Every structure is written in C-alpha cells, then in structure tokens.
C-alpha cells in the first residue's frame, strides 16, 4: 500500500484501493511513463469482467451475496452462452456510468460523480435516431445555461456487427481550415474532422468560430452529416470587465463540453458511442483552447493589445496576458449565466473528493499532471498533494478513430 | 523503447537511453507513483558500477577500447581487490560530477551541465578546513553577482570512519523561528535546522531574513558551528518596477542557491558532502518560496495592497498577485546585477537540452512534474513535451538527515 503525503498540511494516507487495479498501465520499476497522454495502445474472458462488475454492483447496495445476486450471475452466464454477449439492467448501467466517471484519474470534477443523468439509447438504430438522442442530450444538458451532467449510452459493441460511432471528438467543435499560407483559420485541433465533413458534402464557412456538423455512424454504414440547430448550441461571446477592446477581438466559446469519442466499458461490455457532458473549468477555455500554441494561440495578440513588452520573456507578458484571458472567460460565462468553475474552486473541491474517497474506498486514482491546472499550479492545493494513478473498471477509455 | 511525443509540434522520438536504467523507481504496471517527492526509501557490485562508470568516462573522451581504457579497468579491479574500494582520478571526478548533474531528472537547468567548476576537497581533514573550502566555493560561485556553477567534493564514504556532512540543506538559508502557537517567524522550511543551530550555541536573531550559521560535521565528530562572513552572502532587496509600496514589505532573497544535503554517487563511490550551486529560476523565489502557504505565504498581503477582490476565487486575485511578485523578483535581481533566469527562458533552454541529449545519448531522464514550472505551466514548451523518468548513475541522491 503506497504511502501518500500532502506537503502543505503534512498529512499522511495510504492508498489501499490501488491494490485492486484491474488493467496494467505503462510504468515499470525501470522507468515512469506517467506523462504520456496515451498510456497505450473471448467468452470466458468477457464473463470474468462481467462477474466482477456484478459483484461490485451488489456490494454497493449492501445486497452482498444475497438472493438477487446469485440470480443475476446465472442470468449473465446463460445470456453469454446463448448470444456471446449480455444485456445490462438499467440500474446496473446507471451505476456503471457513474463508477466510470468516479474512476477517471484525469477528471478534476469528480466531486460531482454521484449526480449524472443517464439517457438510455440502447434501442437506437440509424443515424437519424442517434441525432435525435443527441439533440435531446444537448437540450437537457444545456438547460438554458444551468448546465447539468448527462451521458447518453448508445448500443454496445457485439460480435459480427458494426459499431455505433460519433466521429466528432465533441458534440460542439469549431472548424479548422488549412490555408495557403500554411496555417489554420479556426481551431487547428479540428482540421481532420473539418475536411471529413467537407468530404462528406458540407459546405464550409470562413470564420474562426464555425460550429461543425455531426458525422454520426450507424453499424455497417457510411457516416451521415447532420447540422445542429443553431438555437441548440449555446455560445458565450468573450468580453473583459475593464479592457473594452477585448470584445473587439471577436472571441467566443461554446457552453457545453460534451465528449463524444471515448469508449465506455462496463462489466466487459464496450459502448463506443456514449457521449457525456458536464461544464467547463475556466482554464480549459482561457488557457488551453485559446492560448495553446497549437490551438487558437491568441496570447501574443492580447499582450499587444495590453501594450506589454513582448521582446523580453522576463517582463512576464505571457503570464499577464493569460490571466486577463482567463478573467475574460470567467466574466463572460457568469454574465451569460452559463455554469463555469474557476480552477481554484475546482481543485479545492477535488481535495474534498479525495477525502471523501479515502473514507469510501481507501484511495482514489488520480493523475497529477492532469489534475494540477495549466496555470497557477502551485497556487492550488492539488499541486502539494501526492497522488497515485491506476486503472479501475468501469472506465472511460480512448479508442481508435473510426476512419 | 517508449515512444515520446511533443504535442505542440507533433514530433516523435524514442527514449532508448531508458533501457539502460540501473536502479529501480517506485512505479509498477499496477500503479504509477511518479508524483511522490521521495521515490525511494560488497566487492562485485562495486566493480560492476565502477566498470560502467569507467566505460562512460572513456566514451566521453572518444577513447573507448583504448589501451588507457583497459588499463584503467584493470587498475580499478586491482585496487578493489586489495582494499575493497578505489579512488577516482581527478579527471574522473570532474566528469562524474558533470554527469550527475546531466542525469538529474528534476533539474530544468541542465543545458549548462558541461559548464561546472569542480573543486576537489577530497584531502579535507577537519571541519575547519571544510569551512574554508565552503567559503572559497561561495566566493567563486557568487562572483559579485555574475553567478558561476560550481561543486566542491569532500572525501568519499569509507569503512570504519564517519561521513563528512553539511547539516544545512543549502549553504545560505534564512532562520525559521517556530512560535509557541505553531506560527513561524522566518522561513518555515528551516525550523528544524534553526533549532539545531540554537542548540549548538548560535545566538538567534528575531528577523524574517536571518542568515543561518553552518553546522559542519567532520568524521566521528559532533557538528561544529561556523558563521558565514556577511561580505560573502550576496542578497537582493525586493522591489517592484511600478508598485512602489512593494519595497516597504521589506522582502529580500539571497543570490546563490547552493544545495548542501544531497549525496553524490559516482562509479559506486558515495560522497555524502558535495555542495553544488548554480543560479535561481525566478519562480523558485517568487512563487514557491514567497507564496507557498507553508513558506512565507505572502500572497494575500500582496493582493490586499494591490486592491484585489480577495473575497472570491473567480477574481483570480491569487494569480494576479503571484505574477506581480514574480515580476518583482526578476526586476530586483536584474537591478542588483545578480544572475537569474525566468521560467520561460529556462524551459526554452531545456527543450534545447532535450534535443541535444536525444542526439548525444538517445534520450534524457526528465521528471515532468518538476520540470514544468509552478506558474504558467502550459504557457511553457515543456508542458507539451512527454517525458520518461528514470535513474542513471552518476547521480545526485537524497539521503537521511544526519541527526
Ligand atoms: C461536472 C463538471 C465537470 C468538470 C468541471 C470536469 C473537469 C474536467 C477536466 C478539466 C478534465 C481535464 C480535461 C482536459 O484537460 O483535456 C476532465 C477530464 C475527464 N473527465 Fe471530467 N469534468 C466534469 C464532468 C465529467 C463527467 C460528467 C464525466 C463523465 C461522466 C467526466 C469524465 C471525464 C474523463 C473520462 C476525463 C478524462 C478524459 C481524458 O483522459 O482525455 N467528467 N474533467
Ligand atoms: C545553472 C543554473 C541552474 C538552474 C537554473 C537550475 C534549476 C533547477 C530547478 C528550478 C530545480 C527544481 C528545484 C526545486 O524545485 O526545488 C532543479 C533541481 C535540481 N538541480 Fe538544477 N539548476 C541549475 C544548476 C544546477 C547545478 C549546477 C546542479 C548540480 C551540479 C544542479 C542539480 C540539480 C538537482 C540534482 C536537482 C534535483 C533536486 C531534487 O531532486 O530535489 N542544478 N534545478
Ligand atoms: N486528439 C488528439 N490529441 C488529443 C488527445 C487528448 C485530448 C484531451 C481531450 N479531452 C477533452 C475533454 C475530456 C474530458 C473533459 C473535458 N472537459 C470537460 N470539462 C468535460 C467534458 N465532458 C464533461 S465535462 C474535455 C486532446 C487532444 C490527436 C492526436 N493525433 C491526431 S488528433
Ligand atoms: N523539507 C523536506 N523535504 C524536502 C524534500 C525535497 C526538497 C527539494 C529541494 N530542492 C532544493 C533545490 C534543489 C535543486 C536546485 C535548487 N535551485 C537551484 N536553482 C539550484 C540549487 N543548486 C544549483 S541550482 C533548489 C525540499 C524539501 C523535509 C523532509 N523531512 C523534514 S523536512
Ligand atoms: C505531455 C503531457 O502529458 C500532456 O501535455 C498533458 C499534461 N497535462 C494535461 N492536463 C490537462 N488537464 N489536460 C491536458 O491535455 C494535459 N496534457
Ligand atoms: C506532490 C508533488 O510531487 C510536489 O508538490 C512537487 C510537484 N512538483 C515540484 N516541482 C518542483 N520543481 N519543485 C517541487 O518542489 C515540486 N513539488
Ligand atoms: Ca510597447
Ligand atoms: Ca591510489
Ligand atoms: Cl475543450
Ligand atoms: Cl530555494
Ligand atoms: Gd492604443
Ligand atoms: Gd506606481
Ligand atoms: Zn509512473
């Protein structure tokens, strides 16, 4: 059991849950690979994961080993012998979706993990039904700006059948257009999906903030291109409380972060289409999406407008510009009554989550590199907290792109 | 070999040097412990370490497999067989100290690793001569503000005789006076060594920036107290370029960071006293030392004087105050003409180092959590660089406090 210390307070805890880690991460005693974004890369096997998820579920509701427990087990045995897969009960699916959030080591927002709206789309067929399940997700989750966590679970993977996939990495993304001068107009992260929407017959725009269509894929069919109703996509134009020229930069961002390209794994079952959404932490927008050199890369533009000395690094013009962009994000979302959390509040809440989980299950998988915010690292309490990273199931996992 | 990606550029390398990692770290495939501050804690083993180190030395001078190379291997073999230990040649000690720096995964300053002044103190015989070696180090390294990197190597550990030790964690450190109610006047990080100085006869001040004496330990002797000559301890009064009241906070910091409590390991030999010094990166002073809640903890005081809304996190008052403190540190050192580097220049030079080392050795041991600075993380290039962490020798190691 690894000993983990908080260096600001001096307290000591032991992570006993890590002993239960299901799958293997990339690290070995010879070398640590914790900084890598991708830690890389049947029926008797499926049953072993299915059984242990069922034992988890019944333990969580006290029905440990009771009458319903053994019958659920024998039910799954027969289903897999008959079909090669099995179906989850609706409560097992809700439980599994929440635990997979709960287990996500890179999520700072997990204090909220017990509050998630699960929409069961497992009866889905055709891309037009996908699109309708999706549009209902967006409307429920946006809630006119009072954002609410939700996940929509499309049908699981099963043998011989194609897959339900959402090709977009998020439900709301801005286009990125390659151009003759080499660079990109819009979001460079989305250059690949933007030329795929264009390939599949989408006439493009020419703005830096053109909302992309959806490329939805039903099993064993090409993807179909749907346009989101513009009144369903809530956006926040960015202004600054005191810098009147900030608004003239024409920056904006969207209200709803809805990740649509990860795979949900519950009890050996795999759901390659299960978009989930919550709300944003301010640094995600104002530091990473707007100030990453390979994203909108606006930081020098703001610094020029602030009349900072951009010819020496030691003036900290980069630091001052980033702070005001983050201020603009917080101010604009609050003025628009869209849910947003600043990085100080979020990390403080994650510390409370760590304490809750220490008592609930003896530890908490956490990825320090991703929990610590991308600005003001050591000004937040998570910087001073040692963390243990490991993989538990149910889980959210990366998956190959469909194409 | 592990594949390593830079996400700003897209470039990919493979760290083939990690396959040579001798000593094991704390991670397993089950769980990564990369965020822990302390990752750890006879003839034929000594020989294999000595042989490896000699091989390194002769590769470094492009004379591998030469007559000199084979003869030095045999010579080390004969001395170990006769005495159980051996002595480094002078040239080997210089090379080994530079390689220990080169190998230190938590150091962002390693672009400089070849420029290191190595003072050989292995004939030192008393605490009094120890103090003279230390004063000569400080005088050379300080160089009236034009800082020069240096290390002084005291005698190696050997059987049947105590170690040389410097009890202080750095050669220059401010007193921390622990108060009855748990508060501290001075630097809270130095409360232990402050109480040991007093217990060993030092008459304490009552300031916040009182320079501590040195407790110097010769073999098999209690530590002895030595006062540093005030004229050898260069200090920088802190002022801000545009906030004139900042000067009235009465803050100061010292010019020379000189770590004195780590163990230097070279070719299986151990040097428990081997102080080394370079110059500061400004975030060490302005962010960690002055703004850590468990250090000087000045953030709220500064934010109040700047008239910031400290009642709500979403004002980003902490971020704004931390930036101006960091500006004051850089401005103040530049005004005093004392060497300092800001976190942007330092991290840019570290990216150059990684490219150099990829060519030279096929990889570079790097601790992401320590290389990324404590403010403005994703605004520096190292945030977006995947890193592999591992232990090479020669090495600087932690060791228990001698009391
Ligand atoms: C309720 C508000 C939420 C906030 C403020 C929040 C915050 C965050 C942040 C800042 C990250 C780091 C993402 C990045 O830097 O790219 C993250 C990661 C993650 N979150 Fe949360 N999150 C929330 C809700 C949710 C929900 C509802 C789920 C799923 C049910 C979830 C699952 C995940 C996963 C799987 C990751 C890791 C993604 C990856 O590894 O790429 N989060 N979260
Ligand atoms: C020349 C300018 C240098 C700069 C700007 C620099 C910078 C740094 C910084 C910022 C750290 C992190 C320290 C902390 O957070 O406590 C570090 C760690 C370290 N530095 Fe450097 N350094 C320099 C020179 C040197 C030299 C000359 C040596 C040894 C000969 C050295 C050896 C180390 C080691 C071993 C560590 C790891 C300390 C630990 O693990 O606690 N550095 N350095
Ligand atoms: N895509 C590539 N790299 C890449 C890899 C990983 C990433 C990180 C993507 N995380 C997006 C994300 C995930 C989780 C939470 C949020 N934020 C939230 N607050 C919420 C979202 N939902 C409910 S809350 C955002 C980005 C890019 C490529 C590599 N090669 C060609 S493309
Ligand atoms: N305090 C404890 N732990 C503790 C453990 C580790 C640490 C980290 C200590 N880094 C000090 C340091 C190291 C390397 C470089 C610099 N900076 C420079 N620029 C240079 C210095 N030389 C040439 S360049 C500063 C600090 C505290 C305790 C344990 N038990 C009771 S207290
Ligand atoms: C190389 C490194 O793992 C990569 O840049 C990580 C670091 N930490 C992160 N932290 C968050 N929150 N989001 C990220 O995308 C990343 N990227
Ligand atoms: C818990 C965590 O490892 C600890 O706070 C580390 C994080 N990164 C660091 N990085 C540097 N450069 N110096 C430090 O002291 C630390 N502290
Ligand atoms: Ca100007
Ligand atoms: Ca000899
Ligand atoms: Cl995003
Ligand atoms: Cl220091
Ligand atoms: Gd102007
Ligand atoms: Gd002024
Ligand atoms: Zn690891």
Q: Which ligand is nearest to the CA of B339?
A: 2
B259, B342, B350, B399: residue to mutate for ligand 4 pocket, most atoms within 8 A of CB? B259
In A8-153, which ranges are continuous DSSP H helix? 43-60, 67-83, 90-102, 127-142
Contact status, residue B131 vs residue B269, Cβ threshold 8 Å:
no
What CA–CA distances, in Å, run from A112 to A108, A324, A373, A389?
Answer: 10, 28, 18, 20
Q: Which of A27, A299, A334 sits opposite B27 (nearest CB)?
A: A27
The continuous run of DSSP H or E covering A253 comes out as: strand A252-254
Angle between helices A317-335 and B317-336 (to 10 degrees): 170
- Give the closest residue to B233 by CA, choosing from B209, B250, B251, B216: B209
Among B36, B42, B345, B172, which residue's Cα sits nearest to residue A386? Answer: B36
> What DSSP character marks residue B314?
G
Ion ligand 8: residues, Cβ under 5 Å = B 87
- In terms of phi and psi (left: phi > 0; alpha: psi -120 to 50; beta: otherwise), the region of A182 is left
Q: At what angle do helices A67-83 and A43-60 cross, to 10 degrees?
A: 160
Strand ranges in B224-275 using DSSP code E only, listed in sequence order: 224-226, 235-237, 252-254, 258-259, 263-266, 269-271
Closest chain A residue to B23 measured between Cα atoms?
A: A30
Q: Do A31 and B7 touch (CB under 8 A)?
A: no
- Helices B67-83, B43-60: crossing angle, 10 deg rounding: 160
Query: What Rg do the C-alpha atoms of chain A give, in angstroms?
Result: 23
Beta bridge partner(s), residue A12 = A5
Which of A7, A33, A321 to probe by mutation at the B interface, max B CB count within 10 Å? Answer: A33
- Identify whether the C-beta of residue A137 lies closer than 8 Å to the C-beta of residue A119: yes
Q: Are B142 and B255 in contact (CB under 8 A)?
A: yes
Q: What share of chain B is helix, strand, coil (3-state, %, to 5)?
A: 40, 15, 40
Count the alpha carbons within 13 Å of B180 in the hemisphere toward its beta carbon: 0
* B43-60 helix and B90-103 helix, angle to the nearest 10 degrees: 90
Residue B319 and residue B69: Cα distance in Å, rounded? Answer: 56
What radius of gyration, in Å, describes the C-alpha atoms of chain B? 22
CA atoms within 13 A on the CB side of A339: 16
Nearest atom in ligand 6 to the alpha carbon of residue B371 is: 12
Torsion on CA atoms A46, A47, A50, A55, rounded to nearest 10 = -150
Q: What is the resolution of this structure in A?
A: 1.8
Q: Whole-angstrom Cα distance, residue A303 to residue A297?
A: 12
Return d(Cα A176, Cα B156) in angstroms, integer.
61
With a CB cutoff of 8 Å and minimum separation 6, the contacts of B7 are: A37, A294, B384, B385, B386
Distance, CA of B377 to CA of B371 (rounded, Å): 9
Q: How far apart are CA A396 and CA A103, in angstroms?
A: 8
Residue set of the binding site of A: 27, 32, 35, 107, 170, 279-280, 284, 288-289, 369-370, 383, 398
d(CA B88, CA B268): 11
Query: How many CA within 13 A on the CB side of residue B317?
Result: 18
Alpha carbons within 13 angstroms on the beta-carbon side of residue B129 total 14
Strand A235-237 versus strand A117-120 pairing type: unpaired
| Count of beta carbons in the 10 Å neighbourhood of residue B402 | 15
Question: Which domains are seen in chain B, by residue range?
Answer: 15-122+149-159+263-277+347-371 (3.90.340.10), 123-148+163-234+398-402 (3.90.440.10), 235-257+280-345 (3.90.1230.10)
- Integer Cα distance of B394 and A370 in angstroms: 31
Q: Cβ–Cβ of B35/A386 closer than 8 Å?
A: yes
CB B398 within 8 Å of CB B263: yes
Nearest to A30 among B18, B287, B323 (CB): B18
Please give the span between the terminal C-alpha atoms of chain A, in angstroms, as a whole number. Answer: 42
My answer on whether omega of the bond before A151 falls inside 30° of 0, hence cis, is no
End-to-end CA gap in chain B:
42
Alpha helices by DSSP H, listed for B124-272, are 127-142, 191-199
Where chain A is discontinuous (C–N > 2.5 Å), the residues before each break are 41
For the residues of B26-67, what is the DSSP string, one character each? S-BTTBB-TT-S-----HHHHHHHHHHHHHHHHHHTT-TTSH
Residues B362 and B355: beta-carbon distance below 8 Å? no
Closest CA to B352 of B385, B397, B396: B385
Burial string for B251-283 (b: 16+ CB within 10 Å, else e) reads: bebbbbbbbbbbbbbbbbbebbbbbbbbbbbbb
């Amino acid at each position: 059991f690894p000993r983990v210390k908080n260096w600001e307070v001096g307290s000591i805890t032991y992570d006993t849950l890590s002993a239960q880690a299901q799958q293997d991460g990339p690290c070995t005693p010879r070398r640590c690979l914790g900084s890598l974004v991708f830690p890389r890369k049947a029926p008797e096997q499926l049953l072993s994961q299915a059984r242990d998820f069922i034992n988890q579920y019944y333990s969580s509701i006290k029905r440990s080993g009771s009458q319903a427990h053994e019958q659920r087990l024998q039910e799954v045995e027969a289903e897999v012998a008959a079909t090669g897969t099995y179906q989850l009960r609706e409560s097992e699916l809700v439980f599994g979706a929440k635990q997979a959030w709960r287990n996500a080591p890179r999520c700072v927002g997990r204090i909220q993990w017990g509050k998630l709206q699960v929409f069961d789309a497992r009866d889905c067929r055709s891309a037009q039904e996908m699109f309708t399940y999706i549009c209902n997700h967006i409307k429920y989750a946006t809630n006119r700006g009072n954002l609410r966590s939700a996940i929509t679970v499309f049908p699981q993977r099963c043998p011989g059948r194609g897959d339900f996939r959402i090709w977009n990495s998020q439900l709301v993304r801005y286009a990125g257009y390659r151009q003759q001068d080499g660079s990109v107009r819009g979001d460079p992260a989305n250059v690949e999906i933007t030329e795929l929407c264009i390939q599949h017959g989408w006439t493009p725009g020419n703005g830096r903030f053109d909302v992309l269509p959806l490329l939805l894929q039903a099993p064993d069919e090409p993807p179909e291109l749907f346009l989101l109703p513009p009144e369903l996509v809530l956006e926040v134009p960015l202004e600054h409380p005191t810098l009147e020229w900030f608004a003239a930069l024409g920056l904006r961002w969207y209200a709803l972060p809805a990740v649509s390209n990860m795979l949900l794994e519950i009890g050996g079952l795999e759901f390659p289409a299960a978009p989930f959404s919550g709300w944003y932490m301010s640094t995600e927008i104002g530091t990473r999406n707007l100030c990453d050199p390979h994203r909108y890369n606006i930081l020098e533009d703001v610094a020029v407008c602030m009349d900072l000395d951009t010819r020496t690094t030691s003036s900290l013009w980069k630091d001052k510009a980033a702070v005001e962009i983050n201020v603009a994000v917080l101010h604009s979302y609050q003025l628009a009554k869209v849910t947003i959390v600043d990085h100080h509040a979020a990390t403080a809440s994650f510390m409370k989550h760590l304490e809750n989980e220490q008592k609930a299950r003896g530890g908490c998988p956490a990825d320090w590199a991703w929990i610590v915010p991308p600005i003001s690292g050591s000004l937040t309490p998570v910087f001073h907290q040692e963390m243990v990273n490991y993989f538990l199931s149910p889980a959210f996992r990366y998956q190959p792109d469909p194409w």
